């Protein structure tokens, strides 16, 4: 059973700028085995609009090269859930966040959670936060995740993550 | 830094038989990241011979195809560590087991620990064990591992956890 906890009382406008996918899990192995997989993407940047709306902007490998994509996402009545259609996908949840240094999201299709729901630490400068990883996977602990990966520093600046 | 914790006492005649492989981790993404990755071996059955040798029979994906392959592992001084050839290892690491249920090992190369890391819960019977994955993630909790998978019933009895 998937139940995601999103995060009381965010305020988007504070997670604008550059952000770097220090770690990243999935429901379903075949969303990120490879580096071809469907939900391999790797956030550039968080650019929340006037309206309370949010776009976001990632590397993805596309035939065989390093693709720029913009995900454009929808406030709702939860501050921190966002309609999307993208990446058959549609919904982005923010779980937690101190805006400072670490932001942990989700993915999912509501229509099948299952088969969908990929979810990401991120993190404001390129190195890896001990600390930020555990309130990560401290978040996994309750949801049924089957793949796990962890970037170094050196991944973190590289392009599309190699 | 590496540091692996063997098993004490380990009587290799009782491991004998069908295994499953049910998680792997790696030290290095690129090890397990893909089916065609270099580690990426589910075990079939342990065949302990009469010197205290082992012979370890795996399918592996070789060119588009679920392959077999017998990897022949050489007793050492310690019980829980055999010498290999294969899969660019040298060394299989026998970390815990209760010969019914479960088996934790690892492979690496000594020379390159931190490139070549790679480990696995076994168990006996083609089904999740929560115990057994709880042993694993303990073992795993004090090395560097950047990759971890985990498979379910279904792929447990396929050909190459498909």
Redesign the interface.
């Known amino acids: 059973i998937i139940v995601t906890q999103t995060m009381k009382g965010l305020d988007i406008q504070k997670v604008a700028g550059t952000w770097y996918s220090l770690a990243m899990a999935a429901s379903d192995?075949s969303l990120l085995?490879?580096?071809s997989a469907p939900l391999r993407v790797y956030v550039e940047e968080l650019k929340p609009t006037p309206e309370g709306n949010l776009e976001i902007l990632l590397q993805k490998w596309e035939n065989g090269e390093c693709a720029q994509k913009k995900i454009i996402a929808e406030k709702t009545k939860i501050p921190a859930v966002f309609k999307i259609d993208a990446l058959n996908e549609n919904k982005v949840l923010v779980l937690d966040t101190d805006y400072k240094k670490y932001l942990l999201f989700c993915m999912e299709n509501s229509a099948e959670p299952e088969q969908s729901l990929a979810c990401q630490c991120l993190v404001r400068t390129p190195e890896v936060d001990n600390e930020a990883l555990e309130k990560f996977d401290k978040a996994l602990k309750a949801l049924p995740?089957?793949?796990?990966?962890?970037?170094?520093p050196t991944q973190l600046e590289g392009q599309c993550h190699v």
Do not use: V
């Not at 995740?145 to 170094?152: D, V």
């Open positions: 192995i085995d490879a580096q995740m089957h793949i796990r990966l962890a970037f170094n």
